[PDB]
Design a protein around this nucleic acid. Structure first.
Ligand SMILES: [Mg+2]
Ligand SMILES: [Mg+2]
Ligand SMILES: [Mg+2]
Ligand SMILES: [Mg+2]
Ligand SMILES: [Mg+2]
Ligand SMILES: [Mg+2]
Ligand SMILES: [Mg+2]
Ligand SMILES: [Mg+2]
Ligand SMILES: [Mg+2]
Ligand SMILES: [Mg+2]
Ligand SMILES: [Mg+2]
Lengths: 101, 88, 70, 271, 119
RNA sequence: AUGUUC
RNA sequence: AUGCGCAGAUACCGGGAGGAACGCCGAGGCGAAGGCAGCCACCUGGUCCACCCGUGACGCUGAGGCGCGAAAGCGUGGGGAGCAAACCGGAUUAGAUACCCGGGUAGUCCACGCCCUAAACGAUGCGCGCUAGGUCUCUGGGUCUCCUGGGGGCCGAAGCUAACGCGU
């Protein structure tokens, strides 16, 4: 059990019929691998700094979670499987480290 | 990794007296944990010869500790080796 | 010009999503700037590069953009 | 892998036998689809027309499924991988959810338990078959039709495959096992993946039998015959060719090209 | 034949030659030139004068397509890079903007031995 | 660019 | 010049494949050595500091032994973009079995198994104590303008050294 931030980037061009599908697939997957979502943040549609899946934009999600560490890779394997899921970065959550006081 | 809870379970179990955290028994049990844990990793990862050096160290450290115990008090050397399942 | 550090208040250099801030450590060619320009410590500069890259992968910042006017 | 032996005999010093790990799964064949009688016979109505064939083990033909479009959209689960003495590949027994059973040739990677399906809306994952046109270019693909609906003819031997290089009209371009670049109709079916049991080409036969076990009778050189028999026949003790080297029948056999000149199918090849 | 007011002018300046291809705004070559399309042969193609000549000859050929303005994109270290840009600015053609877009491995293929006195 | 010997 | 190129190359753009290596950050850092460089996750070893909490000399070294050991190389498989011994071509030359150019096979990559070498170098065995300081630097701790520990450099007391130089 440790805190991870699960970043996800979706096809910008979805409608909320299509999006909620994905968003629910991710929810069902999270829960499936024993991930208890804490925070969550639909920053949504962003202009990427380079094209991704030929697309100038990505729809962005962020899920802070606590899960068993030994299942984290397998979850990222699953989250990626879907087509409209175009990036997945899972990152052990870290203390912030500041410059300036 | 060994958790803070897991390591303390071993220490209680082997401490000659509460608040005993060093001591040849606790040390040698603490090492055994590491050694078994690490032997298991090497099992899967035969090619990690760097972590293996550390194993060699721990094995030799425990060997040394146990030699000291066998020399000062031989009964609790035996009592321990039994309790821990080693020198075989 | 100035040092980039000397330009911003209390900021977290683990935050690979503050692209608003990070792009500022990145030169007009997308290159991670050296310490003589970021004016970071050695340690800070490494935390930074790490998160800059994490961000580049996420799509937020460039690995490379192009030099304008020769 | 390939099973090696210690030199307890001569011969055995060199034999290597296929690794049958991928198979065991099922070791007799499927009574229903399997047996056709397969008519052995090294030559035609009377005459040897292909030399040096014969003997060698009895075999049942296993009818396999080379047109997959019969069964668009019916999933099938992979029951078994089994040995097929009639081909380098191994084959996959599919239980369709219909009931129906078939044999596809077993692609590399196909796992017993997987599901598989044919058709234009089929997932691009191993062992599904699709019209080429619905398959992402660069996907590598085995058991491919050359003309729509005429059955799979390309890339069926152990470990072979083709890769889609591009689309161009109703045609795609495949790189074939041979390295030929061909245009193959987009409606032509193909199944995603490579053929596998790719270790096949490495088995060292090891002994003169064994060839014999596979129906391959001794090949006698032309040299070594007399001139009635062959262009290299004759000469007093051991002799070089003395002619540009030739078949019995007399064509040359080093470099002389034989694909028919004016063949319509040339418009569509390139390697 | 075709008609494009604005487009791109690519400058590819190696050490051995300078070659300019001018393109419509989707990047499709409208015309090109080089040290060797101009009279030059061998080592003189990599000369800066050739680059000048190439760039104008290339500029000129695109009047015929009704080219007016180009974005310039440079790729290369190499003698001709500089002059071929100068040639274009004052050429009739208007340089909207200059860009160095020189391809550069993010440490990638092993170079030929001659580019690898390298440590 | 090369360019040996006593 | 070989070579590629009107069977349309070069330069430009779109689609795709595939392999190898990770630009900037980047000088320092880690490891016993060899050596280790994108990012992420899991597994895992060494190491530093602080509290001064536990054990109580349990220590140093280490003939043999065991394991690790760059590159090339070997075996079985895989993989193969770029590079490239050998090799083929073009030049250069008195010759050119070289240097320069165009190609090119092993190999360079991966798995497993070998090989066990090297200017494997700091050409400096390991451990401990003791003998001015100055300065730059990595990384901990600090009633933080300096102190205190662990590393990495340069200059130097005393001293050593054939000399060069070495010098907490
Ligand atoms: Mg005859
Ligand atoms: Mg003859
Ligand atoms: Mg004779
Ligand atoms: Mg005490
Ligand atoms: Mg070695
Ligand atoms: Mg090697
Ligand atoms: Mg090899
Ligand atoms: Mg050899
Ligand atoms: Mg060469
Ligand atoms: Mg020596
Ligand atoms: Mg000194």
């Amino acid at each position: 059990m440790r805190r991870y931030e699960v970043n996800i980037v979706l096809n910008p061009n979805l409608d909320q019929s299509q999006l909620a599908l994905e968003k629910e697939i991710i929810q069902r997957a999270l829960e499936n691998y024993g991930a208890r979502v804490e925070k969550v943040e639909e920053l949504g549609l962003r202009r990427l700094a380079y094209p991704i899946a030929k697309d100038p934009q990505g729809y962005f999600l962020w899920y802070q979670v606590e899960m068993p560490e030994d299942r984290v890779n397998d979850l990222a394997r699953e989250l990626r499987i879907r087509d409209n899921v175009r990036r997945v970065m899972v990152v052990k959550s870290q203390e912030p480290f500041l410059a300036n006081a | 990794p060994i958790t803070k809870e897991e390591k303390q379970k071993v220490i209680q179990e082997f401490a000659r007296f509460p608040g005993d955290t060093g001591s040849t028994e606790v040390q040698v049990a603490l090492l055994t944990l590491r050694i078994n844990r690490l032997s298991e990793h090497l099992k899967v990862h035969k090619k990690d010869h760097h972590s293996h050096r550390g194993l060699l160290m721990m094995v030799g450290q425990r060997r040394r500790l146990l030699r000291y115990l066998q020399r000062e008090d031989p009964e609790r050397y035996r009592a321990l080796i039994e309790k821990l399942g080693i020198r075989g | 010009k100035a040092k980039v550090k000397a330009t911003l208040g209390e900021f977290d250099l683990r935050d690979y999503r503050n692209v608003e801030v990070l792009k500022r450590f990145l030169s007009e060619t997308g290159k991670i700037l050296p310490r003589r320009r970021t004016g970071l410590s050695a340690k800070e500069q490494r935390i930074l590069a790490k998160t800059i890259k994490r961000a580049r992968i996420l799509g937020l910042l460039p690995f490379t953009e192009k030099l304008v006017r020769k | 892998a390939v099973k090696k032996f210690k030199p307890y005999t001569p011969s055995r010093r060199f034999m290597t036998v296929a690794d049958f790990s991928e198979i065991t799964k099922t070791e007799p064949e499927k009574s229903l689809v399997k047996p056709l009688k397969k008519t052995g016979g090294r030559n035609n109505q009377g005459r040897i027309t292909v030399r040096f064939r014969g003997g060698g083990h009895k075999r049942l033909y296993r009818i396999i499924d080379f047109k997959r479009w019969d069964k668009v959209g019916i999933p099938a689960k992979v029951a078994a991988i089994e040995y097929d003495p009639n081909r380098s590949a191994r084959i996959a027994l599919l239980h369709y959810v219909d009931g129906e059973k078939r044999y596809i040739i077993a692609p590399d990677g196909l796992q017993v338990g997987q599901q598989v399906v044919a058709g234009p809306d089929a997932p691009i994952q191993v062992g599904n078959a699709l019209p080429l046109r619905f398959i992402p270019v660069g996907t590598v693909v085995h058991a491919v039709e050359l003309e729509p609906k005429k059955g799979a003819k390309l890339a069926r031997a152990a470990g072979t495959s083709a890769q889609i290089q591009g689309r161009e009209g109703d045609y795609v371009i495949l790189r074939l096992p041979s390295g030929e670049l061909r245009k193959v109709h987009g409606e032509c079916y193909a199944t995603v993946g490579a053929v596998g049991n790719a270790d096949h080409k490495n088995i060292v036969l090891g002994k003169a039998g064994r060839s014999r076990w596979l129906g391959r009778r001794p090949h006698v050189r032309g040299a070594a015959m007399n001139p009635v028999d062959h262009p290299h026949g004759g000469g007093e003790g051991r002799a070089p060719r003395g002619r540009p080297p030739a078949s019995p029948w007399g064509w040359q056999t080093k470099g002389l090209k034989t694909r028919k000149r004016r063949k319509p199918s040339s418009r569509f090849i390139i390697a | 034949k075709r008609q494009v007011a604005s487009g791109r002018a690519y400058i590819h300046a190696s050490y051995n030659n300078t070659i300019v291809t001018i393109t419509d705004p989707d990047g499709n070559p409208i015309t090109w030139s080089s040290g060797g399309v101009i009279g030059y042969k061998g080592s003189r193609k990599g000369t800066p004068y050739a680059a000048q000549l190439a760039a104008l000859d290339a500029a000129k050929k695109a009047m015929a397509y009704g080219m007016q303005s180009v974005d310039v994109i440079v790729r290369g270290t190499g003698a001709g890079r500089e002059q071929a840009i100068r040639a274009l600015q004052a050429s009739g053609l208007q340089v909207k903007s200059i860009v160095d877009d020189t391809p550069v491995p993010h440490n990638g293929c092993r170079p030929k031995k001659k580019f690898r006195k390298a440590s």
